[PDB]
């Protein structure tokens, strides 16, 4: 059970990367890339901007 919250609003510049909202918290966010991450939003897998988002758990 993983959860991540975005500090600001970001827009993914790739088909594999997705965007999220500050209040909109996602789950299943694990650290895969030294600069990027990967989470799951209601069954939506993608990349999380480590520069705009942050891993809670």
């Amino acid at each position: 059970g993983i959860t991540a919250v975005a500090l600001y609003d970001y827009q993914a510049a790739g088909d594999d990367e997705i965007s999220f909202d500050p209040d909109d918290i996602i789950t299943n966010i694990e650290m895969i890339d030294d600069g990027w991450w990967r989470g799951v939003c209601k069954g939506r897998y993608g990349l999380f901007p480590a520069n705009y988002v942050e891993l809670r758990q």
Binding site: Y8, D34, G35, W36, P49, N51
Partner: peptide
């Protein structure tokens, strides 16, 4: 100033050779 511009994006294609 009172406002601050957004932070830069991480290097997705570019990466350092060392730590």
């Amino acid at each position: 100033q009172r406002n601050r511009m957004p932070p830069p994006r991480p290097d997705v294609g570019s990466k350092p050779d060392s730590i």
